[PDB]
């Protein structure tokens, strides 16, 4: 059974730390003592920490700290460093499965609320929706720029998301 651990790297060289870590594993061929290496990313938490599926022998501990540009583990002590949890992994799994259930093409469009317009002449703007037809896919959203924001002729064309 392999439990998780947290590694601190020089923040900014994190992908190179992950690649060098996989390569040190396949050099010193303790392949049965490492499962994965996680750097999670949103469209980047955590800012400088590398998650490692691992077991704890002192040989594998020296291996991970002999990987270059790695400071050390983060735990209660440096003798026996600390794994994190497992009860918060069940709730994190359901949140990771809902990372591609929507948040893309909500059936039609999304006018009426606040949005950032940015396309061609009328670019880098904003304004809330006050008129938009879904039958003809036409959005005459107010062109808020100099106070008087008269919804000019437009469509789900410049409709940003701001």
Partner 1 sequence: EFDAIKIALASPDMIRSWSFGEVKKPETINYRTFKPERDGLFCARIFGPVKDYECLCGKYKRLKHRGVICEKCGVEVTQTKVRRERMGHIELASPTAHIWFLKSLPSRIGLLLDMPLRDIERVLYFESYVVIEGGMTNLERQQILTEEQYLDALEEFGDEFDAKMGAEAIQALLKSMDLEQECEQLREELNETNSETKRKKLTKRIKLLEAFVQSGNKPEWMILTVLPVLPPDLRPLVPLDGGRFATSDLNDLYRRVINRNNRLKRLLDLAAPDIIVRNEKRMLQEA
Partner 2 sequence: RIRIRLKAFDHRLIDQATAEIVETAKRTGAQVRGPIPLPTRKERFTVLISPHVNKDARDQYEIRTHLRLVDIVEPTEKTVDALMRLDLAAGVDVQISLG
Partner 3 sequence: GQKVHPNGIRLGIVKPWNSTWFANTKEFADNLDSDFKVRQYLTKELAKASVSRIVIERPAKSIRVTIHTARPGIVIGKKGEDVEKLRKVVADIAGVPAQINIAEVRKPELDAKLVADSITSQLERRVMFRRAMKRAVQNAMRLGAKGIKVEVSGRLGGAEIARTEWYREGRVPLHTLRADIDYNTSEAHTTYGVIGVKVWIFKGEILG
Give which of partner 3, partner 2, partner 1, none residue 46 binds (C-beta under 5 to 8 Å, depending on kind).
partner 1
149 in contact with partner 3 (CB under 8 A): yes
Measured at the alpha carbon of residue 26, what is the angle toward residues 48 and 60, in degrees to the nearest 5?
65
Q: Give the tokens for residue 48.
A: 């400088």
Element (H, E) at 61: helix 58-66
* CA–CA dist 65, 55 (Å, integer): 14
Q: In terms of CB distance, is 32 or 153 closer to partner 2?
A: 153
Q: Nearest 5°: phi and psi at 66? A: -90, -15
Q: In terms of CB distance, is 34 or 73 closer to partner 1?
A: 73
We find the least distance from the C-beta atom of residue 108 to partner 2, in angstroms, to be: 23
82 in contact with partner 1 (CB under 8 A): yes
136 in contact with partner 2 (CB under 8 A): no
Specify which residues 132 forms β-bridges with.
139
Query: Of 10-18, 51-59, 90-98, 118-126, which part binds partner 2 (CB under 8 A)?
Result: 118-126
* CA–CA dist 21, 42 (Å, integer): 22
We find the least distance from the C-beta atom of residue 154 to partner 2, in angstroms, to be: 8
How far is CA 37 from each of CA 19, 45, 50, rounded to the nearest angstrom?
A: 9, 15, 7
* CA–CA dist 58, 64 (Å, integer): 10
We find the least distance from the C-beta atom of residue 148 to partner 3, in angstroms, to be: 6
- Binding stretches for partner 3 (CB under 8 A): 144, 146-149
- Binding stretches for partner 2 (CB under 8 A): 120-122, 143, 145-148, 150, 152-153
């Amino acid at each position: 059974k392999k439990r998780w651990y947290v590694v601190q790297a020089f923040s900014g060289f994190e992908g190179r730390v992950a690649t060098s870590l996989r390569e040190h594993i396949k050099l010193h061929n303790m392949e049965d003592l490492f499962g994965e290496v996680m750097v999670p990313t949103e469209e980047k938490f955590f800012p400088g920490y590398v998650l490692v599926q691992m077991v704890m022998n002192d040989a594998s501990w020296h291996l991970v700290r002999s990987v270059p540009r790695v400071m050390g583990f983060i735990g209660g002590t440096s003798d026996r460093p600390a794994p994190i949890s497992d009860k918060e992994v069940d709730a994190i799994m359901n949140r990771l499965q809902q990372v591609g259930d929507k948040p893309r093409p909500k059936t039609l469009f999304e006018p009426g609320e606040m949005v950032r317009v940015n396309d061609g002449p009328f670019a880098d703007f904003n304004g809330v929706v006050e008129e938009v037809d879904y039958e003809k896919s036409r959005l005459k959203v107010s062109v808020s720029i100099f106070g008087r924001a008269t919804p000019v002729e437009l469509d789900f064309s410049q409709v940003e998301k701001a």
